[PDB]
Amino acid sequence: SIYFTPELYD
Amino acid sequence: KQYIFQLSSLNPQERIDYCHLIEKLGGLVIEKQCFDPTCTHIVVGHPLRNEKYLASVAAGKWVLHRSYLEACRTAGHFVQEEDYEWGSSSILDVLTGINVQQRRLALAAMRWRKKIQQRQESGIVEGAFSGWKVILHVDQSREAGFKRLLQSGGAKVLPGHSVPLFKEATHLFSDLGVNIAEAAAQNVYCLRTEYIADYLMQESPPHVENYCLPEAIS
């Protein structure tokens, strides 16, 4: 989801 | 007891609904995009390798499934956390779609919560990265997130990446102007950022040699 904070990893 | 929440990996409507519930119940929510060490609990929709999740684990916070708050709503107060922790059988056994990364993340959350809370009552402050003195050379999109993560677990993040700092550093992490080979020549652990998460996710993480940056190899 666009509303979940992106991970710190690829 | 204090009930200071953050929220992570939830739909906006979930976040709004739960902010309202938590306040109604007498707790607080820290509504920030970033991790805030003042929090005591976090409700997570989906276990992920993001700043809030990893930093909460590094500091041994309660990492809780949303059904926690639904049980609170029914009870009319904050209930006992144990049966709603992501790493607990009550949650893990009932849920589907949990992949191996997520299961490890959930289990780690419970494990670190237990470990750290036994040291609190013993009167010592000590997160997962206690004793680490870290140089960060990571993508600018991500650096501040890693810094907060590392600090949450009790690491010192050193200012900058200048060679003079290498003698104070135990770890240098990168995911990419930094003289890495120089640090490696001084036995600083020169490692991929993945080590940080696997260090938390695993009971027995693999050897650091498995995460060596290119300039640090042999």
Side-chain angles (χ1 to χ4, degrees), chain A residues 1 3-10, chain B residues 12 15 46 49-50 101 142 146 193:
Chain A
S1 169
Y3 305 123
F4 301 171
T5 309
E7 292 204 318
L8 288 165
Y9 301 94
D10 299 345
Chain B
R15 287 185 208 244
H46 305 261
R49 266 130 72 250
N50 58 20
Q101 177 170 304
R142 274 166 189 158
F146 275 113
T193 48

Short mmCIF file of all heavy atoms in Angstrom, two decimals, chain A residues 1 3-10, chain B residues 12 15 46 49-50 101 142 146 193:
data_model
loop_
_atom_site.label_atom_id
_atom_site.label_comp_id
_atom_site.label_asym_id
_atom_site.label_seq_id
_atom_site.Cartn_x
_atom_site.Cartn_y
_atom_site.Cartn_z
N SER A 1 0.82 -1.27 0.00
CA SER A 1 0.00 0.00 0.00
C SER A 1 0.83 1.28 0.00
O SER A 1 1.83 1.38 0.72
CB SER A 1 -1.00 0.02 1.16
OG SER A 1 -1.60 1.30 1.30
N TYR A 3 0.14 3.84 1.41
CA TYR A 3 -0.01 4.42 2.73
C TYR A 3 0.79 3.66 3.81
O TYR A 3 0.72 4.03 4.98
CB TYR A 3 -1.50 4.47 3.11
CG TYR A 3 -2.41 5.18 2.11
CD1 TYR A 3 -3.51 4.53 1.52
CD2 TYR A 3 -2.19 6.52 1.76
CE1 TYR A 3 -4.38 5.20 0.62
CE2 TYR A 3 -3.03 7.20 0.86
CZ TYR A 3 -4.12 6.54 0.30
OH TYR A 3 -4.92 7.25 -0.59
N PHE A 4 1.51 2.60 3.44
CA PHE A 4 2.40 1.91 4.38
C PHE A 4 3.79 2.53 4.23
O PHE A 4 4.26 2.72 3.11
CB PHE A 4 2.49 0.39 4.13
CG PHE A 4 1.17 -0.38 4.21
CD1 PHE A 4 1.14 -1.72 3.81
CD2 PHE A 4 -0.01 0.20 4.70
CE1 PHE A 4 -0.06 -2.48 3.86
CE2 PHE A 4 -1.21 -0.53 4.78
CZ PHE A 4 -1.23 -1.89 4.34
N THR A 5 4.45 2.85 5.33
CA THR A 5 5.76 3.47 5.28
C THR A 5 6.70 2.56 4.53
O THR A 5 6.81 1.38 4.86
CB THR A 5 6.30 3.73 6.68
OG1 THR A 5 5.29 4.42 7.43
CG2 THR A 5 7.58 4.57 6.66
N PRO A 6 7.39 3.09 3.49
CA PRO A 6 8.36 2.26 2.77
C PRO A 6 9.39 1.61 3.70
O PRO A 6 9.77 2.19 4.73
CB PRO A 6 9.04 3.25 1.81
CG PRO A 6 7.99 4.30 1.54
CD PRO A 6 7.21 4.41 2.86
N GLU A 7 9.80 0.39 3.34
CA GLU A 7 10.89 -0.31 3.99
C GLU A 7 12.22 0.45 3.85
O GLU A 7 12.35 1.32 2.99
CB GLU A 7 11.05 -1.72 3.39
CG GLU A 7 9.90 -2.70 3.66
CD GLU A 7 10.34 -4.15 3.56
OE1 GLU A 7 11.10 -4.50 2.62
OE2 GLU A 7 9.96 -4.96 4.43
N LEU A 8 13.20 0.08 4.66
CA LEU A 8 14.55 0.66 4.60
C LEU A 8 15.46 -0.11 3.63
O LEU A 8 16.67 0.11 3.60
CB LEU A 8 15.16 0.71 6.00
CG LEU A 8 14.59 1.74 7.00
CD1 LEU A 8 15.04 1.41 8.40
CD2 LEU A 8 14.97 3.19 6.63
N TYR A 9 14.85 -0.99 2.83
CA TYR A 9 15.53 -1.90 1.91
C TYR A 9 14.82 -2.02 0.57
O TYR A 9 13.60 -1.88 0.51
CB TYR A 9 15.62 -3.29 2.54
CG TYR A 9 16.36 -3.30 3.86
CD1 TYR A 9 15.67 -3.18 5.08
CD2 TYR A 9 17.75 -3.39 3.89
CE1 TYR A 9 16.37 -3.17 6.30
CE2 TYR A 9 18.44 -3.37 5.10
CZ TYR A 9 17.75 -3.27 6.29
OH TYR A 9 18.46 -3.27 7.47
N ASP A 10 15.58 -2.30 -0.48
CA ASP A 10 15.03 -2.73 -1.78
C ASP A 10 14.41 -4.11 -1.65
O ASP A 10 13.19 -4.25 -1.52
CB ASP A 10 16.13 -2.79 -2.85
CG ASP A 10 16.79 -1.44 -3.11
OD1 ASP A 10 16.26 -0.39 -2.69
OD2 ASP A 10 17.86 -1.42 -3.76
N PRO B 12 -5.03 4.64 5.89
CA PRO B 12 -5.37 5.91 6.56
C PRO B 12 -6.63 5.87 7.42
O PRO B 12 -6.65 6.48 8.50
CB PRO B 12 -5.59 6.85 5.39
CG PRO B 12 -4.66 6.36 4.37
CD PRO B 12 -4.79 4.87 4.45
N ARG B 15 -5.89 4.20 10.65
CA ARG B 15 -5.09 5.07 11.52
C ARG B 15 -5.94 6.10 12.24
O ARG B 15 -5.74 6.37 13.43
CB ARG B 15 -3.98 5.78 10.73
CG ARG B 15 -2.86 4.85 10.32
CD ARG B 15 -1.72 5.60 9.66
NE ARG B 15 -0.99 4.74 8.72
CZ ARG B 15 0.28 4.39 8.84
NH1 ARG B 15 1.01 4.81 9.88
NH2 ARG B 15 0.84 3.61 7.92
N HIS B 46 1.00 -4.82 9.04
CA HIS B 46 1.83 -5.80 8.34
C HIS B 46 3.28 -5.68 8.78
O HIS B 46 3.90 -4.64 8.56
CB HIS B 46 1.71 -5.63 6.83
CG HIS B 46 0.30 -5.67 6.34
ND1 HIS B 46 -0.26 -6.80 5.78
CD2 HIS B 46 -0.68 -4.73 6.36
CE1 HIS B 46 -1.52 -6.55 5.46
NE2 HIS B 46 -1.80 -5.31 5.81
N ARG B 49 10.16 -4.37 7.07
CA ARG B 49 11.49 -3.90 7.46
C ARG B 49 11.57 -2.37 7.34
O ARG B 49 12.45 -1.82 6.66
CB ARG B 49 12.57 -4.56 6.60
CG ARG B 49 13.17 -5.80 7.23
CD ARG B 49 13.18 -6.96 6.29
NE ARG B 49 14.15 -6.86 5.20
CZ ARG B 49 13.85 -6.68 3.92
NH1 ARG B 49 12.59 -6.53 3.52
NH2 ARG B 49 14.81 -6.63 3.01
N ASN B 50 10.61 -1.70 7.97
CA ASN B 50 10.59 -0.25 7.96
C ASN B 50 11.08 0.28 9.30
O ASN B 50 11.31 -0.50 10.25
CB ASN B 50 9.21 0.29 7.54
CG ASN B 50 8.07 -0.19 8.42
OD1 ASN B 50 8.26 -0.63 9.55
ND2 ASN B 50 6.86 -0.06 7.91
N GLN B 101 9.71 -13.98 6.21
CA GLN B 101 10.24 -12.70 6.67
C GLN B 101 9.35 -12.18 7.81
O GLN B 101 9.84 -11.84 8.89
CB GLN B 101 10.31 -11.69 5.52
CG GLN B 101 10.80 -10.29 5.92
CD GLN B 101 11.10 -9.40 4.72
OE1 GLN B 101 11.92 -9.75 3.85
NE2 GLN B 101 10.46 -8.23 4.67
N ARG B 142 17.20 7.30 2.90
CA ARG B 142 17.06 6.32 3.97
C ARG B 142 17.88 6.59 5.22
O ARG B 142 17.67 5.94 6.24
CB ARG B 142 17.54 4.96 3.47
CG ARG B 142 16.53 4.15 2.75
CD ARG B 142 17.28 3.06 2.04
NE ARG B 142 16.39 2.34 1.15
CZ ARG B 142 16.79 1.62 0.10
NH1 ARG B 142 18.08 1.51 -0.21
NH2 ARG B 142 15.87 1.02 -0.63
N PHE B 146 17.65 4.92 9.27
CA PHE B 146 18.65 4.03 9.85
C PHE B 146 19.25 4.60 11.11
O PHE B 146 19.52 3.85 12.05
CB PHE B 146 19.77 3.72 8.86
CG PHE B 146 19.45 2.57 7.95
CD1 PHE B 146 19.26 2.76 6.59
CD2 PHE B 146 19.31 1.28 8.47
CE1 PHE B 146 18.94 1.70 5.76
CE2 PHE B 146 18.99 0.21 7.64
CZ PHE B 146 18.80 0.42 6.30
N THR B 193 23.75 -2.96 4.82
CA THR B 193 22.67 -2.62 5.78
C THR B 193 21.76 -3.78 6.21
O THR B 193 21.15 -3.72 7.28
CB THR B 193 21.75 -1.50 5.29
OG1 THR B 193 21.35 -1.76 3.94
CG2 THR B 193 22.45 -0.15 5.37
#
